[PDB]
Amino acid sequence: PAWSLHSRLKEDTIDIGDLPLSKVLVIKDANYPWLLLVPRRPDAVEIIDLDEVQQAQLMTEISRVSRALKEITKCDKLNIAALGNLVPQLHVHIIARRTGDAAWPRPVWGVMQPLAHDATEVQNFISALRRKIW
Amino acid sequence: AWSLHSRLKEDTIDIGDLPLSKVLVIKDANYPWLLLVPRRPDAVEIIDLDEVQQAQLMTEISRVSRALKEITKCDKLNIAALGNLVPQLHVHIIARRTGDAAWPRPVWGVMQPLAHDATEVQNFISALRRKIWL
Numbered sequence: 001p002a003w004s005l006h007s008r009l010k011e012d013t014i015d016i017g018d019l020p021l022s023k024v025l026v027i028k029d030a031n032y033p034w035l036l037l038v039p040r041r042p043d044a045v046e047i048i049d050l051d052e053v054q055q056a057q058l059m060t061e062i063s064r065v066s067r068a069l070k071e072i073t074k075c076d077k078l079n080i081a082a083l084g085n086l087v088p089q090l091h092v093h094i095i096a097r098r099t100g101d102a103a104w105p106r107p108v109w110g111v112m113q114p115l116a117h118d119a120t121e122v123q124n125f126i127s128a129l130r131r132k133i134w
Numbered sequence: 135a136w137s138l139h140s141r142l143k144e145d146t147i148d149i150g151d152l153p154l155s156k157v158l159v160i161k162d163a164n165y166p167w168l169l170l171v172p173r174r175p176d177a178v179e180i181i182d183l184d185e186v187q188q189a190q191l192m193t194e195i196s197r198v199s200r201a202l203k204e205i206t207k208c209d210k211l212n213i214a215a216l217g218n219l220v221p222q223l224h225v226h227i228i229a230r231r232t233g234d235a236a237w238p239r240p241v242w243g244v245m246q247p248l249a250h251d252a253t254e255v256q257n258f259i260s261a262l263r264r265k266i267w268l
Contacts, residue, residue, distance in 0.1 A: 059192035081214035
């Protein structure tokens with residue numbers, strides 16, 4: 001079986017690379033430093049749809065990526081979530097939060113209209129991420 | 135020695151302990167809603183846990199989320215470590231249904247909490263204990 005990224009996720013992200021299990025994506029909303037991990041298992045919707053090895057690997061990847069994100073952003077608090085009420089394909093949000101951000105202290109989802117990235121600001125972000133993760 | 139954060143204690147009912155995490159039911163009957171609270175003093179982020187603890191946390195999230203989906207026959211699980219207000223690391227595991235009060239939004243802060251009926255929550259608790267602890 002072959003894997004491909006859900007079209008809704010593809011539309012809302014910038015592809016920055018691949019880990020052993022997960023595709024690594026930057027969300028195009030610039031309100032927050034916001035990544036997705038998308039495990040490359042066909043038909044996976046819930047974490048428990050992954051096999052045991054893959055579940056363990058997903059935790060390793062959440063650990064690695066969330067630490068890199070906190071180091072780059074010096075954020076006050078990480079938010080990590082697998083929600084998927086609208087998009088079936090298993091994806092894990094990893095979001096850097098700050099007390100001064102647009103949604104604080106609430107969770108980000110649905111609070112603000114998405115902000116477009118400045119191309120230079122996001123490339124610096126992506127570069128910093130690539131160096132730390134890989 | 136580890137202790138549950140006062141706000142978590144106020145908002146939950148204690149249903150038992152796994153090797154790493156305390157298992158709690160949220161006092162909001164709008165959703166079948168659990169917390170896993172790793173019993174590591176001072177833990178705030180998942181990355182504050184050591185590698186073994188993070189691995190066991192994934193095992194416990196998987197076990198509890200599978201049991202919850204089996205009991206509730208829910209449409210979708212939502213799993214999240216947010217912690218914007220309460221520093222102590224806790225993982226929400228929530229059963230979502232298309233007919234629920236917040237659907238399709240994430241639940242947090244949407245609706246006023248509902249009080250549990252004492253019989254229905256006890257039955258939910260016993261059913262969980264049977265699945266999780268043999």
